[PDB]
Design a protein around this ligand. Structure first.
Ligand SMILES: Nc1ncnc2c1ncn2[C@@H]1O[C@H](COP(=O)(O)OP(=O)(O)OP(=O)(O)O)[C@@H](O)[C@H]1O
Lengths: 37, 300, 161, 447, 351
RNA sequence: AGUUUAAUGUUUAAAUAUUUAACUAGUGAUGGCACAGUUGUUCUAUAUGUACCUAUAAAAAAUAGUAAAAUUAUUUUAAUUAAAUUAAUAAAUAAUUAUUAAACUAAUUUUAUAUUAAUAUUAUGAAAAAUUUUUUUUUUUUUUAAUUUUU
RNA sequence: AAUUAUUAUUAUAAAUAUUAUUUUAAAAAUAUAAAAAUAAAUUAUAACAAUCUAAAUAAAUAAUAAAUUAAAAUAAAAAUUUUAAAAAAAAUUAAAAAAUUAAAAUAGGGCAAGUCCUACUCUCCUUUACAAAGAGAACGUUUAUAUGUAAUUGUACUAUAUUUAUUGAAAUAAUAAAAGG
RNA sequence: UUUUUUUUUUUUUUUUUUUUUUUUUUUUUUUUUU
RNA sequence: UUUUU
C-alpha cells in the first residue's frame, strides 16, 4: 500500500534487528525497551 | 429461515384497530369444530359495531346442537354467521359476500368505488386458499391496478410475502366488495398446552412431531370421548370388543394395518401406525361428528 | 385525429357520415363502437354518433352531443367531493407503493376543466406512473360523468416549504 | 478547480483575495461614501471588498462574482473614484470628442440601468455620462457628440462605439479607462466578437509612444468564467489581477430555491404555468392573479404565442423581445417595471444581467445550457432577497435536468468552467478529454 | 453535510468571533487559543468541535479554514476564530456540549473472569437483566456496576447488553475513552468474535451452515421473519450466524454453537427456533410450547417455568492480547443448569 | 433387448464409449416418392440440415480507419525533451519535435547566448483540500580522482 | 468407424465340429472386484483374497528463452515482483507424493442507464396489395391514390436570439456495460 | 447632409405522524454520539 | 388545512 519504514539490513548477529529499522528519524534509534528472544 | 409473524396477539391489537378504523365490513374464516380457538383474541372487543361476516368452515363435521347456539349468538348481536360444509365450495361462500352486503351495506356515495373488506382468520383454516383463489384469477380477468399484466417478476406468480402492502383482492365487480389481506395474525406458536391438541386434532397445524407426538393427541381424542359408543362403533368397525378399557387395547386392537418386525411366535406390533389412524380419521369427521370447544352459554 | 384533440383539452365526438350508403350494418359497421374501445387509451368513453347528410339521420341528435360536451367541457367539482372520493379509491387500489412511493393524494382540487393532484406530504420524487395516471382519470370520468370530454390534464405538485 | 487552471492562462497566477472588509479602509473618498450610503450601501460584499482596491490601484483586473454580488458597484465605483483623481489631481484635460472611459453593455435594457446607477454618481462631480441605443434616425443622434457631451464616461453597446471610431467621430486618443460589463458573453461570437477588435485599437494606442502615456486600465467583470474569456484576457492583457472566489462561483445563490416540474405533453406546459401563476401578486410601483414573475422562453416565436394565450386568459401579462418596435418595447418594459403587469413573457433578453424586483422565474423551457440557466435563475434572488425558480423540464431536456437536480442538492459548481454557450466546448469536461467507454473485460464471447 | 455547512453559514448565534492579537496569540496553536479562551469545554470536548466541523473555524479572507488542532494563527489578520455559543437548535451539538451492600460488592467480584487497565469481563447469572424493567426494583448489572470499579476507575460502562435469560460473559470498558474504541468490535461483524452455546431440543438440519433471517421488530414485540430474501429494505435488518452442531443427542436434542456475525434481538433464539423449529431448552418466549421443558428426564416438577433457557455467552475474543502474543479469550464457564445437562449426558464440559 | 439420466473415460478401445436415471404398450410405420439456406423438418428447443450452424462450395474486396503484431544496414558528429488550446462580422504567429535552408546592427566583459523561414507532425488523458533530496541511463583503452564512521 | 482397432456390419436361415492370437519371479496409491454385522432381492466396504511388475524389443504425446545453480532466513521499488541485496550452506541417483511454481482485473448483494422484450394514437423507404383513370373494363397491363404497422426503423432601428415540437410508452422480470460497498 | 425651430424614437431651407442511532432491556430504561 | 415528536 503506502510502503513506510524501510529496513536496511547490514549483516546479522551484529545489527541486533532493531538497528535495521533504525536510520529512520523516529522513536527508534533508541534501545528497545522490552525485547523478546 | 421462513417462519411467520411470531409474538403474542394481544400486542397486535392497537395496530389491528387502526386497520379496522378504515375498513367497512369485517370477515373471518374459522373452523366450526373450533368456534373460539381459531378466533383472534379481540373478537369480543375487536369492533362491536362493524358488520362482521363471520364464517365457520368445515361445518358438516361439527356437531349440530352446538351449531344452533353459536349461530343465534352472533345472530343476536347482529353480526352475522354462516356455516358451510366446504364440499359445496367457497363459490357459495363467495355468493354470501355478494348477498351479505346488498342487505347490510350503507349505500356508496360514489357509484363505483369499493366495499373495503377486512378479512382475518388462520391462514391454514381457509383464509389463505380464499385469498389466493380470488387473487390468482384477478390477474387474468382484470378490474383495477390498470396495467397490462406483464410486470410480475420471475418466480412469484403470487405475492403473500415481503410486500403485502395495500395488496388486496377484488372479489366482486359491480358491488365491488374488495377484500384486504391481514398479514397472518393467528396461531402464535406460543399457544397453550391444550390448544395445540385441539388444533392438531382438527387437521389444522397438522404437524405431529417431537413437539406434539401422535400419542399426545391420540390420548386426547380418546380421553375426550370417554363415552364409548358411536365411537366404539368405529372400534367395533374393526373387530373391537365394543368397549375399550383404556388406551392400550383399543390402539393395539386396531393393529390390523399396523406392525413391525415381530417373531412368528410373539408379534410385537407397531402402535404408531395405529396412532396416526385413530388421529387422522377423527380429522375427517369419520369417527364422530362432534366439536371440541365448550360453547360458553354465558356471554363468555 | 382524436388523440390530438384529446391532447388539446378539447372535447371530441365521432361521427360516421355517409351512414345510409352503408348496407345498414349495425353490429357489423359497429366496429366504430368497438375500435374506440379495443386499445384506444383515453379517447374511449367517447360517444360515436351516426349520421347521413342526404338522409338527416341524426343531425338533430348530433346537435345534442355537441351541446352536451360543451357542458362537460366546463364543469367544476367541489374541492370536498373530490377528496372524499379519492380516499375511497385509495382504500381499494392495487398500487403497491413501490410503483408509487407517493401516499394519499391529499386534496385533489379542480382548477379548470382538468384537476390537479397534491401528494401526501412527500417532498420527494413528484410524478406518478402512466399506469397510475390514467387509472386516476379513468375513475374521474366515470364518477362525475366527464366522459363528454373524456380527457383532463391532471397536474401534480408536492407540498412546499 | 485547484488541480486545474494551472494548465490554463489568466490563472495559476495569484488571485487577489486580500479582503479589506469596509469602505473606509479601501480609501474610497468620503465624497463617494456619502453618495454610497445615500444609495443604501453600508457594508462591502465579498467581491467588492477584494476588487475595489485592486482597481483603486491601476491593476488590470478580472472581476468574477456569482449573481447579484455587487459587481456593478465593484468596477464602476472605483473608476469614478479614479476619474475624479484624473481631472482634479493630474488635471488631464477633457478635450472634445475624447472620452476618459467607455463602458460596454450587451442589451439595451442593460445599457440604461448602467447609466442611472452611474447617473446617481454626480457626487463624483464633473463626471457626465451619456448612454445611447438604437432609435429612429439614430445616426442623426450623435448630435450629442457635436453637442455638449465631453462625456468622460460613455456607456454604449460595442457595435455603435466601433462605428463612431471607424468613421472618425470618437478618438480613443485619451481613453484612460476601458471597462467591460457581462464580458462572459460580450467577448465572443455570441454577441459580435466586437468587444475584441475594440480592446486592440485601445491596446495599440497606449503602446504608441508618440502621444502621452495613457495606460488604459482594463477592467473585466463577468459572473461566468468561460474558456474564451481566459485566453483573450490571459494571453493578450498585461498583468490581469484575477478576483475569482472559487468557493462561491458558478453556483446559484443559497436563499434561492428551485422547483422541477416534469411535463409529458407539449400542450400541458401551459396549465402548469397558470397553476403557477395563481400566487396573486400586485405592488404599488415596484380575472386571474399572478405574483412578481418572469417567464423565459425558448424563442420569440413562442414568447408571444404564450403571451397572447396568457393575456386572452385574463392575466396582466407583459411582453419583451427584440423584434418589438421601439414604442412598444419601451412601454412594455416600463409597465412591468413600475408596478403594472406583474408578469413578463420574456425571451433571453431578460436573462442577461438585469436588476429589478422579480421574485419568481418560470423556465417555460429549462435551457440546454448552464449559462442560459444561471443567467435566468440569477435574476430571481439578488443580494439576499429570497426567490423561487420553477423548471418545466421536458423529455428532451431531461439529462441537463437529471444533473441540475443532482448538482443543487450538493451545491456543486455547475462544471466550474461553464460552457455550451460562449465556449461551445465540445470538450464536455474541460481538458484534452474525449471521455472513454471504459473496460478491462477480456472475455470476448465466442459462438 | 452540505446542509450542515448551510446552517453554519446562516447562524448568527453569538459567533464569539475571537481576534488573534499581534502579541500574545498570533503564532500560538489553535488548541491553545480555544482552551485558554473557553475554559468551559474539556480539552477532549475542544478537540471534538475543532476536528468535527462543528468547529471553532478561523476566518481570514473570504472562506472558512476548518483546521486541525495544531494549525497556528496568522500575522494579525485580525484572523477571527469563530466559536459556537447557542449550538442547541437544528445543529444538535456533539457529545460534551441506593447503596451496594456487601454480599453484592462481593457477589460482583466472583463474577470477574478477566480484568486489566482497559476492560473488565464478568460472568452474568442467567436470569439477572442488564437494563432495569421494574424501574425501581430489579437487581441488574447497571446497578451493580459501582462494584467492578476495582482500583477506583470511573464506573465501568456496559458495552453489549446481554439479554435476561441469556447467561454468560459480558464486557465493561472501565473508561469512556476505551468505550469508543470497543464499538467496532460488536456491530455487524464479518468474521466471528464470540461463541454462544445452547442446547436446542431436536437435531436440526446439517450440522454446519449459516443462517440468514431478516428480522423486523413491530412494537409491540412483532418480531418478523425472512419475508424478503433480499430485504424489505425499510424496517428490516438481517442477522447472520454460522452455527455448528458440536455434538447431538441422537435425534431429540443437540448442543449447538452459534457464532453470531450480527447483533439482532434474540437472534440466537429466534434463529434457533427456526433453524429446525427445534428451539432452545427452556425457551418459553419463542419456542417453549412443545412441552414445558419439552418433556425430558431433566428436573421435571414445576417445569412450566423451571428449566432456564440453556443459552450461554461462552467466549469473547478481546482485542487486548496477552503477555504471549495471543489475543485474550475469556471462557465464562457454564452455569450449573448447563453443567447439569452436560454431565447428565456425560459430555466433557469444556469448563 | 426400442425412449429424455448419472460416474468412469479425459489424444480415451470411441473427434460421446460403458454402466447409473426419469414413461408410454404398435389394426398406423425401418427409407419408398418429397422438401434446401434472408431457409428446410418443425411434437415453436432462434434445437437439427455429414465429426466448430460463423451451414458447406466458389470467386472477392470496404474488413486493426482498432494499447493489434512485424517492418532486413555497427563503428556515427549538432541542440531542446509537457509543451500547446478563444466554433461562429475589420484583432500579428497553436505548440512540439523533425527535415531543409537563412541573417548580426542603437543592445558593455576584449563575457555569454539555437534566433528566423519553408515543409512534415495536433488524443497519452487527474478528482478533492491547502495556497494568494539529487545531476544522472551511458562510457574507445590504459593510468589518474577531493563526499566514512555506532551505540 | 483413418487401422489388421471398443464390432456376430444379419434381410434371411438356423443347432451337440475342442475348428485355432494375448507376454511378464515382488512393494504402494488407485482401478475392477471381494468370507463376517447396525424374509426379500439391496446397502455402505474407502476390509481378506483376485487381476494390473521390472528388465528385454519397440516406440510416441502435448512442453521447451536460457540459466550456473538451487536448500533455508531476512528488508527493500505508485509494484502485482520478476529480480537484485545482506545472511546462510545448499551433494549425486532412482522411486513415490503434489506443498509450491506453468490455465482471464472474477463470484454476491444495492443502484442507474442500455440492448432484449411486449404495446400502439402520432415516425420513416417498405413490397405484397386494394380501390381510381384507361380502353362498349372476360378477364392479363400502364398511371394517379391512403389504407395494415402489415415490419423491418428510429424517437431522453443594430442588434440579441437560433441551431431541438418532427413517433410516444411500459421494474422492458433476463442480458449487457458502468459506477457504489 | 446644413443648421434652423420651443420640446417631440422633432422636422426641416439644396425527523415522524395526522384527521438519533445503536449497543441482541422487559410500557420505560440505559449509554454512546450528532 | 392542522394534531403529534
Ligand atoms: N455593497 C452593497 N451592499 C448592499 N447591497 C448592495 C451592495 N452593492 C450592491 N448592492 C445591491 O445589490 C444589488 C445586486 O448587486 P448588483 O446590482 O451589482 O448585481 P450584478 O453585479 O449586476 O450581478 P451579477 O454578479 O449577477 O452580474 C444591487 O443592484 C444593489 O441593489
Amino acid at each position: 500500500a503506502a510502503a513506510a519504514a524501510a529496513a536496511a539490513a547490514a549483516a546479522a548477529a551484529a545489527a541486533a534487528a532493531a538497528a535495521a529499522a533504525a536510520a529512520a528519524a523516529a522513536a527508534a534509534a533508541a534501545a528497545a525497551a522490552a525485547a523478546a528472544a | 429461515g421462513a417462519a411467520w409473524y411470531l409474538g403474542h396477539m394481544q400486542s397486535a391489537a392497537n395496530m389491528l384497530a387502526d386497520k379496522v378504523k378504515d375498513a367497512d365490513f369485517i370477515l373471518e374464516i374459522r373452523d366450526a369444530r373450533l368456534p373460539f380457538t381459531t378466533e383472534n383474541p379481540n373478537i369480543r372487543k375487536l369492533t362491536a359495531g362493524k358488520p362482521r361476516l363471520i364464517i365457520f368452515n368445515k361445518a358438516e363435521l361439527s356437531n349440530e346442537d352446538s351449531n344452533r347456539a353459536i349461530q343465534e349468538y352472533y345472530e343476536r348481536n347482529g353480526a352475522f354467521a354462516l356455516f358451510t360444509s366446504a364440499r359445496r365450495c367457497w363459490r357459495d361462500v363467495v355468493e354470501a359476500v355478494q348477498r351479505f352486503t346488498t342487505h347490510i351495506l350503507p349505500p356508496l356515495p360514489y357509484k363505483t368505488v369499493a366495499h373495503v373488506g377486512l378479512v382475518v382468520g388462520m391462514p391454514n383454516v381457509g383464509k389463505s386458499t380464499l385469498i389466493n383463489s380470488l387473487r390468482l384469477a384477478h390477474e387474468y380477468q382484470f378490474h383495477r391496478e390498470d396495467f397490462r399484466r406483464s410486470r410480475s417478476p420471475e418466480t412469484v406468480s403470487i405475492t403473500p410475502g415481503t410486500t403485502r402492502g395495500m395488496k388486496l383482492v377484488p372479489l366482486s365487480k359491480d358491488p365491488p366488495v374488495v377484500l384486504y389481506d391481514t398479514p397472518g395474525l393467528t396461531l402464535p406458536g406460543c399457544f397453550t398446552k391444550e390448544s395445540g391438541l385441539k388444533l392438531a386434532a382438527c387437521g389444522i397445524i397438522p404437524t405431529n412431531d417431537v413437539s406434539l407426538p401422535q400419542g399426545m393427541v391420540a390420548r386426547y381424542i380418546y380421553d375426550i370421548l370417554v363415552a364409548s359408543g358411536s365411537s366404539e362403533h368405529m372400534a367395533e368397525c374393526l373387530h373391537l370388543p365394543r368397549v375399550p378399557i383404556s388406551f392400550d387395547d383399543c390402539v393395539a386392537m386396531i393393529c390390523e394395518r399396523s406392525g413391525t418386525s415381530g417373531q412368528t411366535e410373539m408379534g410385537n406390533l407397531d402402535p404408531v401406525r395405529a396412532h396416526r389412524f385413530f388421529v387422522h380419521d377423527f380429522i375427517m369427521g369419520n369417527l364422530g361428528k362432534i366439536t371440541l370447544d365448550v360453547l360458553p352459554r354465558r356471554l363468555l | 385525429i382524436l388523440h390530438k384533440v384529446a391532447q388539446e383539452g378539447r372535447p371530441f365526438v365521432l361521427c360516421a357520415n355517409k351512414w345510409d350508403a352503408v348496407l345498414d350494418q349495425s353490429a357489423t359497421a359497429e366496429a366504430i363502437d368497438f375500435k374506440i374501445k379495443r386499445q384506444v387509451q383515453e379517447v374511449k368513453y367517447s360517444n360515436a354518433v351516426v349520421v347521413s347528410a342526404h338522409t338527416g339521420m341524426n343531425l338533430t341528435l348530433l346537435m345534442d352531443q355537441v351541446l352536451e360536451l360543451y357542458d362537460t367541457w366546463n364543469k367544476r367539482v367541489r374541492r370536498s367531493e373530490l377528496t372524499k372520493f379519492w380516499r375511497k379509491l385509495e382504500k381499494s387500489v392495487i398500487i403497491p407503493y413501490h410503483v408509487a412511493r407517493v401516499g394519499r393524494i391529499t386534496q385533489i382540487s379542480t382548477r379548470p376543466p382538468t384537476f390537479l393532484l397534491q401528494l401526501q406530504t412527500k417532498k420527494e420524487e413528484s410524478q406518478l406512473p402512466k399506469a397510475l395516471q390514467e387509472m386516476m382519470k379513468n375513475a374521474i370520468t366515470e364518477e362525475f360523468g366527464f366522459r363528454g370530454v373524456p380527457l383532463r390534464l391532471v397536474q401534480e405538485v408536492k407540498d412546499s416549504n | 478547480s485547484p488541480a486545474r487552471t494551472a494548465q490554463s492562462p489568466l490563472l495559476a497566477k495569484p488571485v487577489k483575495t486580500k479582503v479589506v472588509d469596509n469602505f473606509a479602509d479601501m480609501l474610497v473618498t468620503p465624497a463617494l461614501q456619502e453618495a454610497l450610503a445615500d444609495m443604501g450601501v453600508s457594508t462591502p460584499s465579498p467581491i467588492q471588498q477584494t476588487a475595489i482596491e485592486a482597481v483603486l490601484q491601476r491593476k488590470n483586473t478580472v472581476i468574477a462574482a456569482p449573481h447579484g454580488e455587487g459587481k456593478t458597484l465593484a468596477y464602476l465605483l472605483p473608476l469614478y473614484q479614479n476619474m475624479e483623481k484624473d481631472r482634479d489631481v493630474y488635471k488631464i484635460p477633457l478635450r472634445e470628442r475624447r472620452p476618459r472611459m467607455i463602458l460596454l453593455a450587451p442589451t439595451k435594457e442593460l445599457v440604461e440601468q448602467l447609466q442611472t446607477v452611474c447617473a446617481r454618481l454626480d457626487a463624483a462631480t464633473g463626471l457626465t455620462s451619456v448612454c445611447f441605443t438604437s432609435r429612429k434616425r439614430s445616426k442623426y443622434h450623435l448630435s450629442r457628440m457635436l453637442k455638449n457631451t465631453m462625456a468622460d464616461v460613455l456607456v454604449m453597446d460595442p457595435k455603435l462605439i466601433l462605428r463612431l471610431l471607424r468613421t472618425r467621430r470618437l478618438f480613443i486618443e485619451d481613453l484612460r479607462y476601458f471597462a467591460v460589463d457581462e464580458a462572459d458573453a460580450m467577448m465572443s461570437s455570441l454577441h459580435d466578437h466586437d468587444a475584441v477588435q475594440l480592446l486592440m485599437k485601445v491596446q495599440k494606442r497606449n503602446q504608441f509612444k508618440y502621444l502621452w502615456p495613457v495606460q488604459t486600465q482594463y477592467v473585466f467583470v463577468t459572473a461566468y468564467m468561460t474558456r474564451k474569456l481566459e485566453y483573450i484576457v490571459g494571453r493578450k492583457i498585461s498583468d490581469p489581477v484575477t478576483c475569482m472566489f472559487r468557493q462561491l462561483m458558478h453556483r446559484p445563490q443559497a436563499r434561492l430555491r428551485h422547483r422541477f416540474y416534469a411535463i409529458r405533453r407539449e400542450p400541458e406546459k401551459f396549465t402548469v404555468l397558470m397553476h403557477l401563476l395563481r400566487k396573486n401578486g400586485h405592488v404599488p410601483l415596484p380575472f386571474a392573479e399572478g405574483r412578481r414573475t418572469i417567464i423565459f422562453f425558448r424563442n420569440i416565436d413562442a414568447t408571444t404565442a404564450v403571451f397572447h394565450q396568457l393575456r386572452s386568459a385574463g392575466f396582466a401579462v407583459s411582453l419583451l423581445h427584440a423584434s418589438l418596435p421601439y414604442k412598444v418595447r419601451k412601454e412594455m418594459y416600463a409597465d412591468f417595471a413600475s408596478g403594472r403587469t406583474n408578469i413578463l413573457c420574456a425571451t433571453d433578453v431578460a436573462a442577461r444581467g438585469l436588476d429589478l424586483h422579480v421574485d419568481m422565474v418560470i423556465n417555460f423551457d429549462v435551457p440546454t445550457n448552464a449559462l442560459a440557466y444561471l443567467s435566468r435563475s440569477g435574476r430571481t434572488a439578488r443580494m439576499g432577497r429570497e426567490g423561487q425558480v420553477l423548471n418545466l423540464y421536458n423529455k428532451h431536456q431531461g439529462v441537463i435536468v437529471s444533473a441540475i437536480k443532482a448538482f443543487l442538492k450538493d451545491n456543486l459548481p455547475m462544471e466550474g468552467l461553464t460552457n455550451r454557450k460562449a465556449d461551445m466546448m465540445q470538450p464536455r469536461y474541460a481538458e484534452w478529454r474525449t471521455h472513454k467507454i471504459n473496460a478491462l473485460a477480456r472475455s470476448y464471447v465466442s459462438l | 453535510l452540505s446542509l450542515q455547512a448551510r446552517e453554519e453559514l446562516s447562524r448568527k448565534s453569538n459567533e464569539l468571533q475571537y481576534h488573534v492579537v499581534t502579541q500574545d496569540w498570533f503564532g500560538q496553536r489553535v488548541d491553545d487559543f480555544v482552551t485558554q479562551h473557553h475554559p468551559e469545554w474539556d480539552y477532549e470536548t475542544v478537540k471534538r468541535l475543532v476536528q468535527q466541523g462543528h468547529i471553532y473555524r478561523y476566518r481570514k479572507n473570504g472562506k472558512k479554514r476548518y483546521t486541525r488542532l495544531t494549525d497556528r494563527l496568522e500575522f494579525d489578520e485580525l484572523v477571527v476564530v469563530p466559536t459556537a455559543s447557542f449550538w442547541e437548535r437544528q445543529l444538535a451539538p456533539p457529545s460534551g456540549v441506593f447503596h451496594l451492600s456487601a454480599k453484592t460488592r462481593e457477589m460482583a467480584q466472583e463474577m470477574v473472569l478477566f480484568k486489566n487497565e482497559h476492560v473488565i469481563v464478568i460472568n452474568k447469572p442467567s436470569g439477572v437483566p442488564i437494563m432495569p424493567t421494574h424501574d425501581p426494583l430489579a437487581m441488574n448489572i447497571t446497578d451493580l456496576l459501582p462494584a467492578w470499579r476495582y482500583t477506583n476507575t470511573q464506573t465501568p460502562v456496559i458495552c453489549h447488553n446481554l439479554d435476561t435469560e441469556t447467561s454468560g460473559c459480558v464486557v465493561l470498558a472501565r473508561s469512556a475513552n476505551t468505550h469508543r474504541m470497543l464499538g467496532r468490535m460488536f456491530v455487524k461483524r464479518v468474521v466471528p468474535n464470540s461463541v454462544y452455546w445452547g442446547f436446542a431440543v431436536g437435531k436440526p438440519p446439517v450440522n454446519f451452515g449459516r443462517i440468514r433471517m431478516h428480522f423486523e421488530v413491530q412494537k409491540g414485540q412483532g418480531g418478523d421473519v425472512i419475508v424478503a430474501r433480499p430485504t424489505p429494505t425499510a424496517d428490516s435488518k438481517v442477522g447472520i450466524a454460522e452455527f455448528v452442531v458440536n455434538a447431538s443427542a441422537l435425534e431429540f436434542g443437540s448442543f449447538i454453537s452459534f457464532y453470531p456475525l450480527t447483533t439482532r434481538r434474540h437472534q440466537e433464539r429466534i434463529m434457533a427456533a427456526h433453524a429446525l423449529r427445534a428451539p432452545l431448552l427452556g425457551d418459553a418466549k419463542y419456542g417453549g410450547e412443545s412441552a414445558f421443558p419439552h418433556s425430558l428426564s431433566l428436573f421435571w416438577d414445576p417445569a412450566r417455568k423451571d428449566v432456564p433457557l440453556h443459552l450461554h455467552h461462552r467466549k469473547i475474543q478481546l482485542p487486548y492480547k496477552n503477555g504471549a502474543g495471543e489475543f485474550v479469550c475469556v471462557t465464562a464457564p457454564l452455569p450449573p443448569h448447563m453443567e447439569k445437562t452436560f454431565k447428565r449426558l456425560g459430555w466433557p464440559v469444556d469448563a
